[PDB]
Amino acid sequence: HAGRTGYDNREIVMKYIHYKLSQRGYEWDAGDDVEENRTEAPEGTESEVVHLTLRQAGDDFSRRYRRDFAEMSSQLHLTPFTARGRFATVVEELFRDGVNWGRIVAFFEFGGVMCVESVNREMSPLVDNIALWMTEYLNRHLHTWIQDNGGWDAFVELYGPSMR
Ligand SMILES: CC1(C)CCN(c2ccc(C(=O)NS(=O)(=O)c3ccc(NC(C)(C)CSc4ccccc4)c([N+](=O)[O-])c3)cc2)CC1
């Protein structure tokens, strides 16, 4: 028993980060497996309603906070070795006491800022590694808080767009 959508932290971050990159027009090679994979068709109105909420809400939050996540980015510095180790330290502080919708969204936005940081210099591919770590930690901590407290749909119900 577990819904019938097929939610996946990996796919959620992939879609979110994708739009973040598309904004600039950088064809992110996320789906290296471009062999037309139409298993059960792309149609997924189920998890679709949640995607728009997370992607739209996430960006909405970051927009409300001009100086916080970006300002700190300067400390993150650029490097493929420390990048991985520096990422955890950032998400670790986000959820130090307890998790919440507002916190989840925050981390989500943070990951994108970092994934793009690499592209700023010359590490677009790094965007893939970022989404990977985000899915590990997200599910390592959030998935438990989200699933235990309803699930992905729980948030969409709370932040149900005007009518739709
Ligand atoms: C960069 C930071 C250091 C990250 C952590 N921060 C937070 C900021 C705001 C919240 C927060 O608002 N929590 S909430 O639980 O009170 C909430 C408020 C609003 C909304 N959704 C809107 C209004 C639809 C879009 S605007 C938005 C989205 C998420 C967070 C903040 C603003 C949701 N939600 O999507 O579930 C949840 C939590 C942490 C402070 C800045």
From Swiss-Prot:
Coiled-coil stretches noted in the UniProt entry, renumbered to this chain: none
What Gene Ontology biological process does one annotation of this record name?
A: dendritic cell apoptotic process
Q: Which InterPro entries match?
A: Apop_reg_Bcl2 (IPR013278), Bcl-2-like_sf (IPR036834), Bcl-2_BH1-3 (IPR046371), Bcl-2_fam (IPR026298), Bcl2-like (IPR002475), Bcl2/BclX (IPR004725), Bcl2_BH1_motif_CS (IPR020717), Bcl2_BH2_motif_CS (IPR020726)
Q: Where is this motif: BH1?
A: 93-112
Q: Note the effect listed for residue 149 to A.
A: Partial loss of BAX-binding and 50% decrease in anti-apoptotic activity. No effect on homodimerization
GO MF entries? BH3 domain binding; channel activity; channel inhibitor activity; DNA-binding transcription factor binding; identical protein binding; molecular adaptor activity; protease binding; protein heterodimerization activity
What membrane topology is annotated for this entry? Single-pass membrane protein
Indicate the impact reported for residue 102 to E: Loss of BAX-binding and of anti-apoptotic activity. No effect on homodimerization
The record's subcellular location field reads: Mitochondrion outer membrane; Nucleus membrane; Endoplasmic reticulum membrane; Cytoplasm
* Disease per record: A chromosomal aberration involving BCL2 has been found in chronic lymphatic leukemia. Translocation t(14;18)(q32;q21) with immunoglobulin gene regions. BCL2 mutations found in non-Hodgkin lymphomas carrying the chromosomal translocation could be attributed to the Ig somatic hypermutation mechanism resulting in nucleotide transitions.
Q: What is known of its domains?
A: BH1 and BH2 domains are required for the interaction with BAX and for anti-apoptotic activity. The BH4 motif is required for anti-apoptotic activity and for interaction with RAF1 and EGLN3.
The record's PANTHER family line, in alphabetical order, gives: APOPTOSIS REGULATOR BCL-2, BCL-2 RELATED
Quaternary structure per UniProt?
Forms homodimers, and heterodimers with BAX, BAD, BAK and Bcl-X(L). Heterodimerization with BAX requires intact BH1 and BH2 motifs, and is necessary for anti-apoptotic activity. Part of a complex composed of SEPTIN4 isoform ARTS, XIAP and BCL2, within the complex interacts (via BH3 domain) with SEPTIN4 isoform ARTS and XIAP, SEPTIN4 isoform ARTS acts as a scaffold protein and stabilizes the complex. Component of the complex, at least composed of LRPPRC, BECN1 and BCL2; the interactions prevent BECN1 from forming an autophagy-inducing complex with PIK3C3. Interacts with EI24. (Microbial infection) Interacts with Toxoplasma gondii ROP17; the interaction probably promotes BCL2 phosphorylation and degradation.
Name this polypeptide is given: Apoptosis regulator Bcl-2
> What is the phylogenetic placement of the source species in the record?
Eukaryota, Metazoa, Chordata, Craniata, Vertebrata
